[PDB]
């Protein structure tokens, strides 16, 4: 009997620490949603250079065409 | 001595007009002096 009053003090203090790696255990989840947000934000930025590169991409095909010509109308596109 | 002078001021006459320098074969002065409709280069050899 006092002997198994110490095995409950004992599991009282294994109920507190499990209790605590519960909490962590959902603050670390809350961490990867707020990661996984902060990662789009990241492939947003990496888009938005990709759309630079198209420009320039865009650029260097057109002045090719213009440069190799070895041998007409004015429909363009404007957004 | 006489006619080697006289050769000599001839040669370097021939050789400094035949000097094909460079004339107007140029895109970008046309290119960016005349603003016109777009097309490839149209160098106005008139």
């Known amino acids: ?79 | 001595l006489l006619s080697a002078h006289l050769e000599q001021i001839s040669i370097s006459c021939q050789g400094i007009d035949s000097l094909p320098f460079p004339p107007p074969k140029i895109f970008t002065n046309a290119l960016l002096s005349n603003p016109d409709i777009t097309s490839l280069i149209r160098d106005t050899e008139a």
């Open chain 1, 1 to 79: 009997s006092p002997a198994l009053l110490a095995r409950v003090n004992e599991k009282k203090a294994e109920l507190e620490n499990l209790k605590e790696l519960r909490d962590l255990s959902a603050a670390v989840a809350a961490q990867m949603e707020a990661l996984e947000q902060k990662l789009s934000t990241l492939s947003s930025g990496t888009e938005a250079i990709a759309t630079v590169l198209a420009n320039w991409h865009n650029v260097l095909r057109a002045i090719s065409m213009a440069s190799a010509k070895i041998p007409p109308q004015t429909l363009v596109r404007i957004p």
